[PDB]
Each structure stands twice: as C-alpha cells, then as structure tokens.
Design a protein around this nucleic acid. Structure first.
Lengths: 88, 66, 126, 104, 50
RNA sequence: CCUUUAGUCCCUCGAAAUUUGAGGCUAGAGGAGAAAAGUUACCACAGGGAUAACUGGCUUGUGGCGGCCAAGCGUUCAUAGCGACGUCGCUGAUGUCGGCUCUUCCUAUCAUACCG
RNA sequence: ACUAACCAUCUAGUAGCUGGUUACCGCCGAAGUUUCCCUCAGGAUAGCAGUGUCGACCUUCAGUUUUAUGAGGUAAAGCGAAUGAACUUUAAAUAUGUAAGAAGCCCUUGUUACUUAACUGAACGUGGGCAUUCGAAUGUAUCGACACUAGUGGGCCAUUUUUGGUAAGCAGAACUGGCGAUGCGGGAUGAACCGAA
C-alpha cells in the first residue's frame, strides 16, 4: 500500500474531466479564496460532508440547494470581477 | 530491494565507521576548547557576560579575532 | 605524457588529487594498460588470494601513473649480448654471455704495516 | 535550571530525577589560585553527545557558564564579570560533586 | 611453517626430516638457506664427510 | 540589501560642558528561484543489521578538582614532559518488599577468658 | 426474503519440518570461497575433486632466491661532504609490485581501407641464422585447453602489523598459522601449549 502522489501516475480522463493539467516540477499558480462568497461555497460542502445521511427527503434537498445557491452567487461575483478586469 | 540488499551487506561496517566518526568529533570539540583555553591564558578583552551566540560560532568568532 | 594501450605503468597515488585515487592496496602497484580515456587509464593488476592470482581492473588517472624501466634492463641486455656475440664471432673466441650469481671471495693476504690494528672494548669509554 | 518547565514532546520521555541534579560547582581560578562554589547558569557544550547538551548532562570536558559575581573579576572597561566559561574537569557520575576550571 | 620457508624446503629437496643435500655456495643460494634457518642445520663438509 | 573581518585615521548626519554613536574606500567571508528542496546521535509507526545474559584470583578503610613541594625517570638529566606522601582552597531513606526455616562452617568478636 | 458428535470414503490430502534409512576391502579425495542475478530458507558463474578427448614438452611451469627497476628512505652515520621524519654521499630491519629471450630477436623484403610531406612508422609473415650454456639460481613424482559430473558454500582461537576508545575492559581491518576430515609422544588432567604427522 503506497500513495499515488509519490508514484508518477498520469491523470486519466473519466466522466469526471481531467481539465488542463499543470506540468510536473513547475509553477502550480496559486489561486486565492479570500473572497467571502468563495469562502461560503467551500464551507457548504464541508458542512454537507460531515452531516451525512438525512432520512428526510426535503432536508436532504435543502442540503444540496444551499450548495447550489452558494455556487451561483460566487459565479455572479466572478463574472462581475471578470467584467471589471475586461474594462481595466 | 537493491537498497535493502546493500544495507544487509554493509551493515556492521557502517556501524563501526559511525563510531569512529563520533570518536573524531569528540577529539575535534575537545581540541577546539583547548585552543580557546590557551588563548584566554595568553591574553584576555571580554564583556560582563558571555556572548549570546552558541558554541562553534562564538569560539570561531574568537579564533577569527587573531 | 602520452600512453599507449599495452605498456607497463606504475601507480603512485599522489595526495594532491583526491579524484580517481585507487585503494591503498593499489598504491605502489604495477600493471598493464588495457584502456586509455581522456583523463583516466584502465590498468590490469594482479592480486593473490590464497594460491592463485585474480586479475583486477582499476581506473587510474594520469596524475598517479608513470612509466617503469623493469623491461628496460631486459632490452639493455638483448643488445649488449647481440653486439658481444657479433664481436666474439669476429675474432673467434667464446665469451660468457650469461650473468652469474656472486661467488664466494678467494684467498688473499693483508699486510699489517702502516695499518696496525686498534683494540676495541665492548662499550666505548673516552 | 528553572523549577518547572513543560518540555517539548520530543524530550518528554527523558526523565531527570531530582536526586541526580546539581546547581553549584567547585570552580577554580587559574590566575588567582582560589576555588569557590559558584552557581551554574547554563550548560553550553557537551563534547560527547549533542543530546546531552540539550538535556543538560554534566560530563568531563563539558563547558558550563558560572556566575562570577562573587569573584570580582575586573574586565576591560572596568566592568565586573558576571558569566564565564568553565570546563568540567572531573567525572560527576563517580563523585557526588562538579569540579570545573575557569576558561579565563 | 610460513608459506615462504615451505617453498624453499621443497626447492632444496628437504622434504623430510633428517634429510640432507649438497648446495653450491653462491649469493642466490645463501639467501635461500638464511630463510629456512629455523628448520635446518648446515655447514662446510670435509673430504671424509663427502 | 545589510552584517563581520584587517588597514587608511581619507569623508558625512545625530548627540554631547571639547567626548561619542550611525554610514563610506580597499577585498575575503554570510544570508533556475513558490515548484519544492536541504537538514537533525530528537519523537511515533513499520522494517532491516549487529549482539544471540553477565561475572569469575572479582571485593574490603580512608573523595574529586586545582596550586605548591617533590626522589627519580625521560630523547643525555629535576624539567619536552610524567611524577607519590603531605599542605592549602571548595563543598530521616524507603515502599513487593518482608517474615519463617534444621544442620554446618567463616571471623570481619556483641558477650564470657586473658593482655597493652 | 437473504446468507455440534460419530462412521466410511475422496485420502497413501498438503512439509522446506522430526526421526530413521541394511556386508567387507582397496584406490582417489574436498570445500567451508570470489563475482553476478527483485539475491539472504534461492539460482548462475568461477575455485577445490573426478572422468573423457585433444595438444604439447624444457619450447614447461614455480606462494623461492638473485639481478634490474618502483612503492615504504622505515633505523643508522656524518654535518674535519653541502643544506637543514620533513638534512643528505651511502644506507638498514621487515615484508611487497613488475620484468628476465626461441612466443625474443637480428639481416633481406610482401600485404594493409591504420599512419606519415615521403619505400616513412604500427600489425601479421615469407627466406637465413642465434638449436651445443638458447642468454641468472634451485627444483620439476608433467603441464595446458575443451566438454561433462558430485559434494561444498559456516566460523573459533593465536602471532605480527594497524585504527579507535575506556578506570580497566574492548571493538574494527590485513597477512599468516592451528582446528574443523587427524591418530601418536609430552605438559599429573583437557578444543586452542610443545614435539611430530
């Protein structure tokens, strides 16, 4: 039993996409999550993962809609930031 | 497997050589004290208290004051 | 210094260079060159184990190798015997062409005049 | 040194019992030709084990820092010396005292 | 016996105890007998002994 | 970018009842780059190596360090140095430990005997 | 909805493990080791022992001495030689590497796509001779090559040299010797001693 991080295993394209892959041994450019909206969406998945199984179907849906609304508000802020960057 | 094979074969030779290194560092540390000991007896030129730098830094600084 | 593959070299192991120095067993050795590189020379040496000799190959740099003259005595003899044999056949007497071990000294007399012997005590007092 | 400290986790197993501790040392001055009992300030260099330096082990040849306030050493610029190097010149494992010579 | 004196006793044909050989004295043969001195007794024989 | 080292006492700012602090010049040393890297007589876990318990003419009543003295010895000998006896200077424990056990021996003798 | 016991047989189930394994005499006779391999409870290779074939032959080989030349210039003597272990004319003790002719040559000349300004050099050879000491000594109860086959692949103690440490112990490295497969004489006795197989 050894870690996949230590072995030089290539990333494989699955239903979950690989995306753009950064080269090994070079600068993996840091993206910051200082924004409160970007802080809320990460917080929604942490609280959802720890809570686990809920018997209620409605409360199970509200646990997912909180994550969905957090993603939408963050995306609107990022698009407004992208528009402000395009103006500048 | 290659690494464990060489450590299985060298083994005691590393253990003996490590003891000779540790016996050498005791000699070097004791000799460096005696160079300090002869220097202060020949002369000195110090402060009220000893220097805040650790050993092999304060001693090397005193041996660079020559 | 230019070296060729096959000559006889002596390894000295100078302490000025710490690169390419062989073991202390290979210090003060003599072997035959089998490989020549840019900065190192491969020398085949002989090492005895119990009764046989196992040939070992070591890479020694230029700074530790030097030519020898062990063969040079053999080639000095092979011309000296050649000229002597031609010079002997020219006038027609045999000559001992071999080298012989040192023999015991023959009898002789030693005069005592001008060299009167001095008597010596077991320890010197003066 | 101090009465109560919370050691790092890396040193918490190493128990030094209270009956095996020393606070003062018999320290001799090479030039004044006297021996006085001086308090120990810190253990500076154990020349056998680096871990013994961190644990404070007193060993023959170990440099310690002693308070020389009672000795009245007048340094350059007219200052009374207060901390000096001393080399332990005995084996405190075998005898129940610490003997040192000042590195002055 | 060390390995070097063992070979000289073979080369001098002294393979057994109370065994004797005649040796011409040179500088090459004298140093042979010098090494095997802890094992041999030698000297100059006369006409009778021959 | 500053620090240290040795020199010139060759030049500025601050303080100070005439003395200082902070920098400069010369040239040695210290501090491919946000991906990760180097390092430790330290710790935890897992593994490998070496050793495969020890002591047996053992032990007892007189400390250690440093100085002075010191017959000798030494690489020729009181000085390369080693160096004894002295003298001087510094200095309630405890608690898985106890209890019981015939016979015989040791003296390192508490008593009884005899001496100084 | 899901997912005990005894009897006979498969079964003489699976072991690298334990124990045992059957006349005599003769001859030859070990190793307890190197190097490599996803190598350490294992394989291959080389060594020691043996068989068969071929090839020789003093044109041989050698845990040896000598000569010549190195690595230790390690002691010593001198400084009425110079200079100052780091000085030397010389040079120990003690072990140690390499070479010593028929495979070397020498004289005449053939090849080469190597080499050189070049019938110049390097390699392999043809023709004559050094075949009687042919180019030190001593020995030699033969030596080399190929193929095949079996057991082996642990160390203990001591001398000498050397490295490190301790209050003293002790720990490591190299050579050699003894014991492991060895009886006999001696040391009253006997793994490690002496003598001698």
């Amino acid at each position: 039993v050894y870690s996949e991080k230590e072995l030089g295993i290539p990333q494989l394209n699955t239903v979950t996409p690989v995306g753009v892959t950064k080269p090994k041994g070079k600068k993996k450019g840091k993206v910051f999550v200082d924004d409160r909206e970007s802080m809320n969406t990460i917080l929604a998945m942490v609280e959802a993962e720890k809570q686990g199984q809920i018997e209620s179907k409605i409360m199970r849906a509200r646990q997912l809609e909180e994550i969905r609304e957090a993603r939408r508000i963050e995306a609107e802020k990022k698009e407004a930031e992208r528009k402000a960057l395009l103006e500048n | 497997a290659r690494k464990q094979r060489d450590l299985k074969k060298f083994g005691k030779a590393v253990q003996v050589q490590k003891q000779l290194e540790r016996a050498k560092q005791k000699r070097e540390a004791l000799d460096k004290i005696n160079q300090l000991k002869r220097k202060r007896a020949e002369g000195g030129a110090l402060g009220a208290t000893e220097a805040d730098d650790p050993f092999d830094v304060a001693v090397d600084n005193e041996l660079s004051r020559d | 210094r230019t070296y060729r593959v096959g000559d006889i070299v002596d390894i000295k192991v100078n302490g000025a260079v710490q690169k390419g120095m062989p073991h202390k067993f290979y210090h003060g050795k003599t072997g035959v060159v089998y490989n020549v590189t840019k900065s190192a020379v491969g020398v085949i040496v002989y090492k005895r184990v119990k009764h046989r000799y196992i040939e070992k190959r070591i890479n020694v740099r230029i700074e530790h190798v030097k030519p020898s003259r062990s063969r040079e005595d053999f080639l000095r003899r092979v011309k000296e015997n050649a000229e002597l044999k031609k010079k002997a056949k020219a006038e027609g007497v045999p000559v001992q062409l071999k080298r012989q071990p040192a023999m015991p000294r023959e009898a002789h007399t030693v005069s005592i005049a001008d060299n009167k012997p001095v008597t010596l005590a077991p320890v010197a007092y003066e | 040194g101090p009465d109560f400290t919370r050691r790092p986790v890396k040193y918490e197993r190493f128990i030094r019992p209270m009956g095996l501790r020393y606070k003062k040392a018999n320290v001799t001055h090479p030039t004044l030709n006297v021996t006085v009992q001086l308090p120990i300030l810190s253990v500076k260099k154990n020349p056998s084990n680096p871990l013994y330096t961190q644990l404070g082990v007193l060993t023959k040849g170990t440099i310690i820092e002693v308070n020389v306030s009672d000795l009245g050493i007048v340094t350059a610029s007219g200052k009374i010396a207060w901390g000096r190097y001393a080399q332990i010149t005995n084996n405190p494992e075998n005898d129940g005292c610490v003997n040192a010579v000042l590195l002055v | 016996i060390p390995p070097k004196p063992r070979k000289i006793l073979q080369l001098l044909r002294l393979r057994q105890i109370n065994n004797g050989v005649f040796v011409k004295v040179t500088k090459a043969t004298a140093e042979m007998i010098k090494i095997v001195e802890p094992w041999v007794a030698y000297g100059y024989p006369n006409l009778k002994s021959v």
